[PDB]
Amino acid sequence: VVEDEIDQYLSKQDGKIYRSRDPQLCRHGPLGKCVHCVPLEPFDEDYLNHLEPPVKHMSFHAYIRKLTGPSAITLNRQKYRHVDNIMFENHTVADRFLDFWRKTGNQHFGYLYGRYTEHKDIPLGIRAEVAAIYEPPQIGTQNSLELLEDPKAEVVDEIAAKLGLRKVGWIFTDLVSEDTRKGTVRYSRNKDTYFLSSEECITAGDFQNKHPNMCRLSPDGHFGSKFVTAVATGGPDNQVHFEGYQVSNQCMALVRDECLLPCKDAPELGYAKESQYVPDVFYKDVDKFGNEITQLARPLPVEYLIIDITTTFPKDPVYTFSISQNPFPIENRDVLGETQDFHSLATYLSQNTSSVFLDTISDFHLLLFLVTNEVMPLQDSISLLLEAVRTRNEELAQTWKRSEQWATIEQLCSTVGLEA
């Protein structure tokens, strides 16, 4: 069992925070060390709590480094994170997703496709970089999501893999218009209600189980997960905002063992099973007193299962894929009269005659269509082009353009247009 390349980068990296002397509060020669200059552990809560913004979960690698280099379950608020930040490459990746809710008024589901990189801001921290959002077959309503069967689910995964990408998590909307003059949205998820349902916590835990973090220090070989979960809801300003979560490892275990239950008409709480024997399950809560009040997890406020993860839009944006003024359409959107077929591609390619062909072709959703469409599936000769995209290799793109297979895509579009 072999860890991710980022977990192999991280384990071979010094996590400390070094300091030369400080001017006023150091009491020794230029060479000596003392409690005020000796380096800082990547798990020291003092350092983290006093950052801006104050961090309250150490990095996972900061945690196992902290560990000196049918009984009853008791849940504590978890002191470490698996992913430390979710960074959308750019606002366009996330706005085109919300486009589905703006058009239909139904909530919408996506899969975050991107990569795991270093998050240099936080000691040993991991960042999840979101580069595409795959929208699968699904039925949405005003007040509910439903996943449909995805025949292409793992052809998608195979294409993205040759793009440098993997599923880093999922996204859903919970968006409701507030003010229909101003164009605002309700601010429904806050301290006084909830940020993630018991419902959504169980499915979060399910996804995290189904997507385990490989780790050489576990007998299972699995431990934790890097599968983040992202919410699009109105914010305190009644504008759409994105919120990053994960669910505690303890909470993964409950869902794995089918012990976690939702509460009806109570999203902010969830049940724990009674009998299938169930070790009684507790949690070490926080009151007002400051007494470590232990309680029985029937009910359980979901907040003792949820892990905040910062969501960033970078000051300098990244473009794994290209921004068209009139982009190729996204999958599963015929509902809104916006379909992927050879008419679309024909007008897409005509619109981009004067463009760098690498930019024109560097679209995730286009690439899925090219490989999986049923008129002409380029399912086997796309490897060449997938690599031109992953690499921003313009010469490598220009040659594939001269392929037999691309020529016939092009005479297809040409006679589609010739029939118009």
Chain residues binding Zn ion by CB under 5 A are 26, 34, 36-37
Buried b (16+ CB within 10 A) or exposed e, 33-57: eeeebeebbbbbeeebeeeeeebeb
Closest contact distance (angstroms) between CB of 33 and Zn ion is 6
Quick check: 75 and 282 in contact, CB under 8 A? yes
Closest contact distance (angstroms) between CB of 32 and Zn ion is 7
Nearer to Zn ion, 29 or 151 (CB): 29
Nearer to Zn ion, 37 or 214 (CB): 37
Nearer to Zn ion, 34 or 375 (CB): 34
Quick check: 152 and 377 in contact, CB under 8 A? no
Nearer to Zn ion, 29 or 54 (CB): 29
Collapsed DSSP state (helix, strand, coil) of residue 117: strand
Q: What angle is formed at CA 101 by the lines to CA 95 and CA 106, rounded to 5 degrees?
A: 160
Closest contact distance (angstroms) between CB of 35 and Zn ion is 7
Nearer to Zn ion, 34 or 356 (CB): 34
Instruction: Report the distance separating Cα 35 and Cα 369, nearest Å.
Output: 60
Closest contact distance (angstroms) between CB of 24 and Zn ion is 11
Nearer to Zn ion, 36 or 91 (CB): 36
Instruction: Report the distance separating Cα 324 and Cα 359, nearest Å.
Output: 9
Closest contact distance (angstroms) between CB of 22 and Zn ion is 7
Nearer to Zn ion, 18 or 277 (CB): 18
Nearer to Zn ion, 36 or 50 (CB): 36
Closest contact distance (angstroms) between CB of 37 and Zn ion is 3
Closest contact distance (angstroms) between CB of 204 and Zn ion is 45
Q: Which helix (H) or strand (E) holds 306?
A: strand 306-312
Closest contact distance (angstroms) between CB of 41 and Zn ion is 16
Q: For residue 169, list its beta bridge partners.
A: 112, 228
Q: What angle is formed at CA 141 by the lines to CA 140 and CA 146, rounded to 5 degrees?
A: 40
Q: How far is CA 64 from CA 125, 221, 394, in A?
A: 13, 15, 43
Q: Which residues are CB-neighbours of 362 under 8 A, at least 6 positions away?
A: 320, 321, 322, 389, 392
Write the burial class of residue 66 (CB in 10 Å: 0-12 exposed, 13-18 middle, 19+ buried): middle
Closest contact distance (angstroms) between CB of 20 and Zn ion is 9
Nearer to Zn ion, 28 or 91 (CB): 28
Closest contact distance (angstroms) between CB of 34 and Zn ion is 3
Torsion angle defined by CA atoms of residues 225, 226, 232 and 233, in that order, rounded to the nearest 10 degrees: 50
Nearer to Zn ion, 36 or 79 (CB): 36
Q: For the chain, how many helices (H) and strands (E)?
A: 13, 17
* DSSP string for 203-224: HHHHHHHHS--B-TT-SSSB-S
